[PDB]
Amino acid sequence: THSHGLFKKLGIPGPTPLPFLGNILSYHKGFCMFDMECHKKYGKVWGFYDGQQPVLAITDPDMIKTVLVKECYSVFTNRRPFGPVGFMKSAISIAEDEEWKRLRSLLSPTFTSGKLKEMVPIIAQYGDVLVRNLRREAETGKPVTLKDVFGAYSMDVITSTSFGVNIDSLNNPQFVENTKKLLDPFFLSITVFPFLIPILEVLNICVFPREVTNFLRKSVKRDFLQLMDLELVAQSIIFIFAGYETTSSVLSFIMYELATHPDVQQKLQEEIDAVLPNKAPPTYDTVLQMEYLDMVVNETLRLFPIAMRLERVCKKDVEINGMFIPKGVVVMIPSYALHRDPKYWTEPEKFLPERFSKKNKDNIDPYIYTPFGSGPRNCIGMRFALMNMKLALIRVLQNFSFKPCKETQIPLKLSLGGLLQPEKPVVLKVESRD
Amino acid sequence: THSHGLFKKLGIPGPTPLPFLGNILSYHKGFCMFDMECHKKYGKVWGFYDGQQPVLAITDPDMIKTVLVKECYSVFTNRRPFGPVGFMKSAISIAEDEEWKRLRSLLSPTFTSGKLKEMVPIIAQYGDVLVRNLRREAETGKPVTLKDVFGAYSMDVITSTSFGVNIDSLNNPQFVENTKKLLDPFFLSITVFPFLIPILEVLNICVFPREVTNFLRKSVKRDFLQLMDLELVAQSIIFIFAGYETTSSVLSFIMYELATHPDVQQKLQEEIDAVLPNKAPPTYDTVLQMEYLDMVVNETLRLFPIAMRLERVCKKDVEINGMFIPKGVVVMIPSYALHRDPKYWTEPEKFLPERFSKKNKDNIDPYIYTPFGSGPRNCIGMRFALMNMKLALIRVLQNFSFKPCKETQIPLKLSLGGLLQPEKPVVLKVESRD
Ligand code: HEM
Numbered sequence: 016t017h018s019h020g021l022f023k024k025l026g027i028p029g030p031t032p033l034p035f036l037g038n039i040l041s042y043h044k045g046f047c048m049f050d051m052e053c054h055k056k057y058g059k060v061w062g063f064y065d066g067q068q069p070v071l072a073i074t075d076p077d078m079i080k081t082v083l084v085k086e087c088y089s090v091f092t093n094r095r096p097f098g099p100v101g102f103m104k105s106a107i108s109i110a111e112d113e114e115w116k117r118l119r120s121l122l123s124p125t126f127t128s129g130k131l132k133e134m135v136p137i138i139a140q141y142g143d144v145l146v147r148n149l150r151r152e153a154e155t156g157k158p159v160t161l162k163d164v165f166g167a168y169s170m171d172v173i174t175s176t177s178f179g180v181n182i183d184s185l186n187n188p189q190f191v192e193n194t195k196k197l198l199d200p201f202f203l204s205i206t207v208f209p210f211l212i213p214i215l216e217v218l219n220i221c222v223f224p225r226e227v228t229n230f231l232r233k234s235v236k237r238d239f240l241q242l243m244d245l246e247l248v249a250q251s252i253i254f255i256f257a258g259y260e261t262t263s264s265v266l267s268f269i270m271y272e273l274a275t276h277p278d279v280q281q282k283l284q285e286e287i288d289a290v291l292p293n294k295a296p297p298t299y300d301t302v303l304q305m306e307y308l309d310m311v312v313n314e315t316l317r318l319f320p321i322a323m324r325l326e327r328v329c330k331k332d333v334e335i336n337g338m339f340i341p342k343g344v345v346v347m348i349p350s351y352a353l354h355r356d357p358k359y360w361t362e363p364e365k366f367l368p369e370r371f372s373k374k375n376k377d378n379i380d381p382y383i384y385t386p387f388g389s390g391p392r393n394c395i396g397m398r399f400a401l402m403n404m405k406l407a408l409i410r411v412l413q414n415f416s417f418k419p420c421k422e423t424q425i426p427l428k429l430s431l432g433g434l435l436q437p438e439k440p441v442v443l444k445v446e447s448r449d
Numbered sequence: 450t451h452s453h454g455l456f457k458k459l460g461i462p463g464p465t466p467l468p469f470l471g472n473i474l475s476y477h478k479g480f481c482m483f484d485m486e487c488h489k490k491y492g493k494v495w496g497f498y499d500g501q502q503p504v505l506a507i508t509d510p511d512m513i514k515t516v517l518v519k520e521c522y523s524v525f526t527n528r529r530p531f532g533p534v535g536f537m538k539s540a541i542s543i544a545e546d547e548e549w550k551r552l553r554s555l556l557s558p559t560f561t562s563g564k565l566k567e568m569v570p571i572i573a574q575y576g577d578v579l580v581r582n583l584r585r586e587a588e589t590g591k592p593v594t595l596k597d598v599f600g601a602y603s604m605d606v607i608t609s610t611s612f613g614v615n616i617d618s619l620n621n622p623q624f625v626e627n628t629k630k631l632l633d634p635f636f637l638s639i640t641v642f643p644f645l646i647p648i649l650e651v652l653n654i655c656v657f658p659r660e661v662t663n664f665l666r667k668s669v670k671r672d673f674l675q676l677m678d679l680e681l682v683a684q685s686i687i688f689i690f691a692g693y694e695t696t697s698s699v700l701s702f703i704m705y706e707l708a709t710h711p712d713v714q715q716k717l718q719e720e721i722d723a724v725l726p727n728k729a730p731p732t733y734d735t736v737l738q739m740e741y742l743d744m745v746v747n748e749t750l751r752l753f754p755i756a757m758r759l760e761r762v763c764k765k766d767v768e769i770n771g772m773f774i775p776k777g778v779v780v781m782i783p784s785y786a787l788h789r790d791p792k793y794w795t796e797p798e799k800f801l802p803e804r805f806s807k808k809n810k811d812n813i814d815p816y817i818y819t820p821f822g823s824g825p826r827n828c829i830g831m832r833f834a835l836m837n838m839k840l841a842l843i844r845v846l847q848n849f850s851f852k853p854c855k856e857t858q859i860p861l862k863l864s865l866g867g868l869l870q871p872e873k874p875v876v877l878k879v880e881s882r883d
């Protein structure tokens with residue numbers, strides 16, 4: 016409660032904080048809705064408090080660019096300090112200043128266009144497993160829970176790309192467990208009581224069950240791995256989360272959009288049959304040829320950017336684009352709110368892949384649309400992820416069409432907790448094109 | 450208990466730590482004796498743990514110089530992080546990296562030879578008050594408790610030099626209280642439980658009774674003050690501690706040595722009567738003329754360096770003079786042990802002012818003898834303090850001689866707690882020279 020006057024003092028509007036809690040009660044509508052309501056009432060810049068942590072929200076593209084790009088190494092180097100992290104402090108997305116640079120450099124080649132082309136033949140093999148497992152639930156006629164099949168796929172791909180362990184997760188429900196081993200109760204407390212984090216740290220009770228962590232090095236025998244003692248595995252733990260949840264979630268969002276916009280699904284499928292003809296197998300070169308696929312993926316990432324917020328800690332008193340940022344304030348770029356802002360988007364709530372057509376993509380600001388972040392600390396896996404999703408999308412759409420059920424939640428609702436994911440799992444009728 | 454193998458791993462000998470406690474139980478003989486025993490058994494370099502804080506002790510002059518002087522701004526910038534500090538974080542002796550530099554620069558002029566000469570007439574006036582208050586207890590014939598009279602003097606000088614408030618503390622026992630408002634119970638706990646410091650911080654219960662702290666700004670009306678909102682007073686809080694305790698303590702040590710070495714007391718007094726004749730008043734120029742006075746003060750500071758230890762935190766993994774210092778280890782220079790080391794001192798336990806005679810002072814290593822520290826972060830008040838003590842010594846010795854009582858503790862013993870001070874207060878017969 017020592018900072019609660021900070022935004023008053025700076026002239027920065029925002030919701031009035033409560034002692035100890037700050038504004039965290041406002042989150043009862045979800046992170047994303049809080050951000051949108053705040054943008055609506057307060058304007059371009061506002062401040063609020065996560066417990067006692069002042070957070071400054073910025074929506075001006077120039078200032079976003081200054082924060083993510085220009086003044087990154089100097090001022091905005093790290094994300095918000097989190098609670099019990101333990102050895103996971105060595106994670107590339109957790110490391111701060113030095114060590115990060117090291118990890119980042121030590122890993123940037125592992126995500127070069129070169130390795131991806133080398134991995135495209137590999138991950139394509141789980142597309143077929145996916146098609147067959149799809150054709151199984153399809154022939155039954157019963158609705159399909161996309162998260163389950165896509166999850167199995169995503170898990171299959173990340174395990175092979177990161178270790179070479181080739182498994183059929185959906186058909187081998189038993190590495191499968193260990194990874195599958197995965198709301199906001201203690202977390203809230205850790206926010207209001209950040210002073211208990213060091214206690215939690217010394218008890219060796221990090222957030223993860225750190226018993227599969229032994230399993231990982233116990234399974235690190237001596238792909239992402241061959242492209243390289245305990246910190247080594249800490250990076251791969253981050254890769255699995257990315258490769259599994261975010262990928263499968265985004266895949267479910269896209270299929271939801273495709274099933275609810277048949278014309279879009281048909282056009283995409285026409286693009287996939289023009290390219291890649293006769294259910295031909297997708298390659299690295301072929302994917303980068305499919306323009307409408309890129310627009311569909313991009314639109315969906317506009318509607319549903321699974322990171323929701325971009326965040327950087329101000330390391331020193333600075334003044335950027337005419338406003339003073341005191342040391343220690345977290346600067347938040349509310350990507351979700353920005354993706355749905357009518358200032359930058361006509362009918363922001365409408366799915367409209369044409370926004371991203373070669374004509375219209377120009378009039379789109381790269382600091383307003385930030386599905387993968389920006390500047391030095393952006394998503395190192397963006398290319399890998401897009402390819403992985405596109406490859407999935409192509410093979411599935413080469414063989415199946417997707418339709419709403421009685422069971423499908425329309426309009427989809429977002430989950431109320433702290434992850435960008437559907438309220439109800441996406442469930443769709445799947446019909447074979449043959 | 451996560452670092453307890455660190456010195457094993459580095460090849461660095463030391464006392465075996467205990468989980469959670471480290472080696473703090475070894476302190477039962479006092480900081481200083483622990484350091485001496487360790488130096489005796491382990492050699493030039495050893496390591497130990499204050500709870501979980503690894504501390505590396507170095508005794509090689511070259512490496513000390515590298516730590517205090519060469520690699521200060523780069524590696525060894527700050528002292529050990531302490532427990533609940535609160536606003537007192539703004540203190541020059543607590544501030545770290547930046548802010549320190551600022552304070553240090555913002556205060557270095559306040560301790561220039563120039564202001565001291567301006568303050569010498571001022572502080573000389575409390576020498577006379579001291580003489581008279583001395584002549585009072587003297588005429589009674591009863592033994593004198595040097596800490597009480599010297600304390601009143603030290604308090605009188607620091608209050609006038611830092612604010613201009615001229616008071617007769619000994620004769621006005623009622624600012625007097627507020628400052629006078631001044632063992633190791635919770636402290637030990639805070640060492641073994643550093644994880645509770647942030648708790649203690651958020652409760653606004655800093656170590657000081659922070660009610661006289663209001664009094665200070667309530668008495669900061671708008672000397673050290675005129676040579677210049679809340680941090681301003683935080684520096685003056687540090688000045689009072691220095692001006693009061695350390696000065697009065699060192700004065701008591703010196704008088705103890707003088708009373709126990711009559712020949713030394715007589716020689717000094719001959720030097721004061723040769724200079725400054727006929728109980729003439731001491732001036733800035735006169736003081737710097739008295740060579741034997743400088744040797745007596747210096748010898749006593751060898752025997753009793755009230756800081757006992759010098760300490761710097763290693764900010765980054767470095768390798769100095771052929772040994773690797775991991776980040777976060779406190780590097781400790783055990784001044785007390787070094788001042789009493791037979792490698793550098795003949796008969797180190799003997800009081801021998803001649804060690805510091807113009808002939809012998811040359812063969813004395815400035816990194817072995819560090820009563821005021823060294824390099825950028827040394828005692829900013831060294832000159833002020835020496836002048837203050839010397840002025841006191843001169844006026845007192847111009848009028849009185851000092852002798853042991855039945856009541857005097859001979860040989861003096863050092864207090865067992867964490868301050869360098871006598872076990873029993875020094876008590877001496879005081880006889881008037883007239
Ligand atoms: C649809 C899939 C994904 C999306 C939308 C996504 C989005 C993001 C975003 C918005 C950030 C933060 C950027 C910033 O701070 O400016 C990020 C960071 C990161 N992502 Fe992804 N991501 C995805 C998948 C992946 C994948 C597949 C990988 C690796 C295999 C990955 C690895 C990382 C890493 C390591 C970081 C932290 C970068 C750093 O700390 O320097 N992500 N991602």
Ligand code: HEM
Nearest residue numbers: 541542691695699756820821822823826827828829830834
């Ligand atoms: C006999 C009297 C004194 C002795 C023996 C003494 C000794 C020391 C020592 C050993 C240090 C640490 C040096 C290092 O870290 O290398 C120190 C620091 C310091 N002393 Fe003194 N001191 C005395 C009196 C004073 C006085 C009278 C003042 C001011 C009026 C003062 C102000 C300071 C300050 C501000 C620091 C911290 C410097 C910094 O953080 O940059 N001291 N002193």
